[PDB]
Write a protein that binds this DNA or RNA. Structure first.
Lengths: 121, 73, 161, 119, 154
RNA sequence: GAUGUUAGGAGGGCAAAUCCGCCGAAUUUAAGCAUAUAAUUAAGCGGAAGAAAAGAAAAUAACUAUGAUUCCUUUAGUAACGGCGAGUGAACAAGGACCAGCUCAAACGGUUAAUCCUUCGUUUGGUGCAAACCUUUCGACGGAAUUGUCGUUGAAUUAUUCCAUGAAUGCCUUUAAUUUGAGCAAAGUGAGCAGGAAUGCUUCCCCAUAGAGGGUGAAAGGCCCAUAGUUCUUUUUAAUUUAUUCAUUGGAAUUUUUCAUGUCGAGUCGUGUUCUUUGAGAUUGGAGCACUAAUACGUGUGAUACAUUUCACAUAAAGCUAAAUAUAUGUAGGAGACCGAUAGCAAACAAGUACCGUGAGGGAAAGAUGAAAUAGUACUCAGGAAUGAGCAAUUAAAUAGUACCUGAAAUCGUUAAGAUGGAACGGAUUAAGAGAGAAAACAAGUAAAGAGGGGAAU
RNA sequence: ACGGACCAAGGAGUCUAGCAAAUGUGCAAGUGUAUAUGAUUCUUUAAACAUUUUACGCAUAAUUAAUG
RNA sequence: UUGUGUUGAAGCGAAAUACGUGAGUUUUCGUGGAACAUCUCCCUAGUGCAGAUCUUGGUGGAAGUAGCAACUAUUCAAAUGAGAACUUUGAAGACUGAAGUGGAGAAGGGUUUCUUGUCAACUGUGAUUGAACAAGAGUUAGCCGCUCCUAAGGGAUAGCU
RNA sequence: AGCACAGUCUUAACGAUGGAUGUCUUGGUUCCUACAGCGAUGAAGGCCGCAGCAAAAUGCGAUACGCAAUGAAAAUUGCAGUGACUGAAUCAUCAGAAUGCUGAAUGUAAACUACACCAAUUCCCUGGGAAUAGUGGUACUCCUACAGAAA
């Protein structure tokens, strides 16, 4: 708003969003944390990982929970284990769900996650 | 200001107010001050009498600062 | 031409669209110049960026009565103030070798201006508390206390005007 | 698959023969691909990248030892010496640009621009 | 302004006396759709507008300083009369007086919440509501020119 | 002078928007046209930089005088030029931006080239992990140079006063600015309605130094990125910290007393003539040719050609120089009362692409399913197949089925109604039919019971 | 007499300079703060605001080739 | 300034006991699926089309019409195939008539060659054919040529402009 | 099960053809700001290649849709395959390494992958041990230095 070095141009920044490399996409695909582990890690949002327990609170599946099973940065989507749907031909595929529509309920912490929560501390 | 222009009120009038017979051509009398003494002579003599010719002697470089002289009564 | 108009005189018979230019950046350039001069007066650390110029009389009978800032004090004026041109140009005094003092009035007025500037000067030591009494007409070097107490006081920029 | 850091410590022999056997197995893979067989075709990428890594390490070692050999001597080969822009190479050195005669040098030492204040 | 030579970057040729076609210039050559098509001219597709917009349009205006000062003084005077503010559209039916002035400690308050609270306590709750609910996306292609919203002035 | 695949080096080509030289039109205007204008332009040739070029008076002025160059405001469409027609057209002063001055030549130095370069070595220390880089002065060698490098800016003499010197000992703080890269960064995913899906509507809470924008299944300050703010990190750069002894080695400014009035750019200036150029006019600059100077008391300028002469100004024929200035180029940022796929660049796309021409060159058309194809049409029937149909199927939706948003007109098909003797349509007036229609085209009120909504009254 | 087979979309008195008249506005023998400067203005803001008691334009005086 | 939108905006089709004199405005139904006005006042312009042998695109009547006419000529039976006048095989009648629709090359072309599939479009009728489409494959030199020589001539060096 | 003459023209409803209108826009345009030369150390430009399946565009150069290093850091996937429980999968940065044939093109040539001359060359171990017909150099003009010849 006050930093004139950064553009507020609609076309410019939606081009940035739709051509962002995978590195920026991993941060764009962050999601809200639940109240309890938000208190635990004293932070508000976190990029989702392949093995996180999540609760979707928006869309047709707005009550379901489940461990996410795949993250597709090309389509800006995540997939959770039990939110499959049937195709016309008749096999099942996961329903693409935007990370902004879900809230983290349990994280998988590793050597590299501990350091980012530490940096947040 | 373009919506106050007179051409707007002749939008569907074919000739745009420039005549159906005489039309609006490109320099039908010449360009600039072309016709002085020949076919614009009446205009020149009626509105700019002493236009043609020269009178008086030359002052080769003037330097107006020399003769600058404001007056008060 | 037609009717009672002034005879046209427009000098647009060449390719003028290549020569049209419009200054959209007049105030932007104002800001840039202001920023540059602020930056250099911060860089030189207290000493003003303005240089002292003499009071001269405008030429021709048009502007006879008016004075303005000339470029450079004369050799005679610098000598009357008691300093050499080479030394004077190191303390923000402009010197030119072209002007001459045809009148005692101009000579004394510019000499007194130079003396006022010299008295207003406070000299910072070249070697950090190695104050020396100066050469070439440069005033003696001020010491630590007067430098400290004068550095936090508004500079007298009216002398340059 | 092989990483650069593990073979950064090898001698030039153990690097060259490793490259040779890697190339031999890549050639075998290419022959198999040319035949009807295609099961192992996906290994060609990995073998090629391993060859690239071995060549990178070997060439970096050779360049480093060549630079060590031409240490100083003020007459290095053109590829060894600086590869700046041509204009930058032909520019006068800062010392040459700042070089000043005795007369003006003594003038500026005797009469330097000096800081001052105004009342 | 449009690009300086827009629509005029082709080869000029109007071979059209006896071709049974209009005398407009046509692009030369063959082997492509463009060949033989109407070249530059305000009526031709891809042919350049009638009077190309130029950067040396009179963008700005010089306004007399006295007139500007007169306008500012008049605007202050107009802000000083209750009926005019109501007519302009501020919901001021609940403030005490329209030339309202507040203590200098307004200049020191620093929280937006307390600024809003002060505005409400002055009797401008309706004005604040009008301002906050006026926010909405404008019509037209201005919203793809970094002009998305349209707000009312408080 | 040659010659050298001797050692070490340089030039060449691309790119041009701004910049520097040359060369050089015509269209056009003059209502014809030849001088003039277009234009000291376009095209052509060559040459540089982040700017270039210009630049420290052989300058103005005529005043109480100014003081290198460049650029802006103005002088000024003025002085002036011009078939004195069309047209063309400066300079000085004034106000500003910026501001900077210098060195060769000539002079002087011969109890001594006091200079320069090449190559080979030595160390004085420092930042780099490294790579590499910055400082270092003792040389030796081989050359160049008296057919002239270097020092001085006339040369000495006193007085003060300044500037460069080495060694030893200690000291490297603190702040403000400026500038990279990184983090942190408030508040709802609360009811209810409807929806495939809120970010919508009601309603209840809040955050705001953040209500810029973008994304998210519909319009989001409180869902996500980011935003306001702030904290670290990078560049340099001001002020602020601290300097103390010992020593001799030079240099500089001014001021005392003398010698001596020095030097100052030659086929150059200038003049004549010719051509061009200029506002420059008995010639503004440039160029060719011919003639060809003076020596500072000279010689150049002082906008009308001369002769005699006063006065003022400047000191040509050698050279360097930052800033203020310009940038239809390249690259990178940021914006807009701009265009919204026949528009905007030629090109929103696999665009200078496809394609055309022997070649120089010419040069398009072409965007949109859906929220999600990780929902792109499964199954059955009929067909050789393409396809079609379904009781079958994804979707909120397939008359959203890949030519897929919407889906106009021209043109055509189906059904219905009507008209129909060498045009058809139409104006005006009605009549018959056929579609629609109650907002004036009747019934306010009153009583009962049934469903509700409000307001006042404690 | 010429143009028009049909339909859609595009399609032509504009922009700048300079002068005048007309009218509105401000000030008035003055008017316009030019370039430029300053300022705890710096998303907007490339706009707004401002100008230590003879810059300049036009006007305030005309006429003459002209010394005037 | 003050408003409409998923309880359906813009647009579009047909309309209206609608209003206006009129340009138009406003409504209804249907379609549509995401934006839209502001007439409170004002600012701004690339602002209003029947024509320009106008520009670009699309589409007509002509019209199932002109026409599918050089090269004497075809016929019987079978195979394949969903389908055979113009694919294949056999038989017959004929043609080209060594100045050849016969064999070799050059220029030009560039994979059209071969085999196997194969028919959306093309092969101006059909087509199962094909120079079309698809997947593979195919060009082997001491002796054939280039390469070497010099020609008409071209470029360059030295100079000179 | 039966009935409408046909054609031509008009109107309505629904369609076909077509792609207008509306709404979108990772594009353009203009202005402002900042930086600014590339090349014999071989540029710009042009060819030729490079992926497991690979035409174009984009990227790259025999290490060839990428190596190394640094920061982030778990995905990348059409199949096949490759990844840790972070020098590994993928992004970003990009300094090291590498950078085919040409092109000012510079050994001679050029609708030639044609032809010279001079060094043989390169690699491995710490003077030997191998492999290579492969690798460098050779333009014209000019400067400094040097060389032996000449009057």
């Amino acid at each position: 708003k006050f930093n004139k070095q950064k553009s507020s141009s609609r076309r410019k920044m939606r081009k940035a969003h739709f051509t962002a490399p995978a590195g920026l996409r991993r941060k764009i695909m962050s999601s809200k944390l639940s109240k309890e582990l938000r208190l635990k890690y004293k932070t508000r949002s976190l990029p989702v990982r392949k093995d996180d327990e999540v609760l979707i609170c928006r869309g047709h599946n707005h009550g379901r929970e489940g461990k996410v099973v795949k993250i597709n940065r090309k389509r800006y989507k995540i997939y959770v284990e039990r939110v499959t749907r049937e195709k016309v031909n008749g096999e099942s595929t996961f329903i693409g769900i935007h990370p902004s529509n879900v809230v983290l309920t349990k994280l998988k912490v590793d050597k590299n996650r501990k350091k980012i929560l530490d940096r947040k501390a | 200001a373009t919506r106050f222009k007179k051409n707007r009120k002749k939008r569907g009038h074919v000739s745009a107010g420039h005549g159906r017979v005489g039309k609006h051509r490109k320099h039908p009398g010449g360009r600039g001050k072309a016709g002085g003494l020949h076919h614009m002579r009446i205009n020149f003599d009626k509105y700019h009498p002493g236009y043609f010719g020269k009178v008086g002697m030359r002052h080769l470089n003037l330097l107006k600062n020399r003769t600058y002289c404001p007056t008060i009564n | 031409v037609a009717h009672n108009n002034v005879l046209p005189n427009v000098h647009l018979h060449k390719w003028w669209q290549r020569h049209v230019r419009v200054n959209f950046s007049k105030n932007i350039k104002k800001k840039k110049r202001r920023l540059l001069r602020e930056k250099r007066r911060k860089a030189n650390g207290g000493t003003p960026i303005e240089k002292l110029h003499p009071i001269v009389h405008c030429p021709t009978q048009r502007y006879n009565f008016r004075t303005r800032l000339g470029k450079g004090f004369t050799f005679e004026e610098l000598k009357g103030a008691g300093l050499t041109p080479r030394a004077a140009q190191t303390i923000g005094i402009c010197y030119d070798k072209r002007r001459k003092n045809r009148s005692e009035e101009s000579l004394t007025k510019n000499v007194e201006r130079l003396l006022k500037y010299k008295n207003s000067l406070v000299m910072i030591p070249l070697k950090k508390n190695k104050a020396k009494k100066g050469i070439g007409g440069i005033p003696a070097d001020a010491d630590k206390n007067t430098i400290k107490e004068f550095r936090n006081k508004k500079p007298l920029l009216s002398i340059f005007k | 698959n092989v990483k650069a850091y593990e073979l950064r410590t090898l001698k030039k022999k153990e690097l060259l023969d490793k490259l040779d056997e890697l190339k031999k197995e890549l050639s075998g893979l290419r022959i198999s691909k040319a035949l009807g067989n295609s099961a192992k075709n996906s290994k060609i990428h990995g073998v090629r990248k391993n060859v690239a890594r071995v060549l990178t390490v070997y060439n970096q070692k050779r360049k480093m030892e060549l630079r060590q050999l031409y240490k100083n001597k003020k007459f290095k080969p053109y590829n060894l010496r600086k590869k700046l822009t041509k204009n930058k190479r032909l520019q006068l050195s800062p010392k040459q640009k700042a070089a000043m005669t005795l007369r003006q040098k003594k003038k500026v030492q005797n009469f330097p621009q000096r800081k001052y204040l105004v009342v | 302004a449009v690009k300086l030579g827009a629509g005029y970057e082709t080869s000029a040729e109007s071979w059209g006396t006896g071709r049974a076609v209009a005398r407009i210039p046509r692009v030369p050559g063959g082997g492509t759709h463009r060949a033989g098509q109407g070249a530059f001219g305000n009526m031709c597709r891809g042919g350049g507008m009638f009077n190309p917009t130029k950067i040396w349009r009179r963008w700005g205006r010089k306004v007399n300083l006295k007139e500007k000062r007169y306008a500012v003084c008049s605007s202050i005077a107009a802000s000083g009369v209750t009926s005019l503010v109501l007519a302009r559209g501020h919901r001021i039916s609940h403030l005490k007086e329209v030339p309202l002035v507040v203590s200098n400690d307004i200049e020191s308050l620093s929280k937006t919440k307390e600024a809003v609270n002060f505005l409400v306590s002055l009797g401008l709750k309706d004005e604040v509501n009008r301002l906050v609910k006026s926010k909405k996306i404008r019509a037209g292609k201005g919203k793809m020119r970094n002009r998305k919203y349209k707000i009312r002035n408080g």
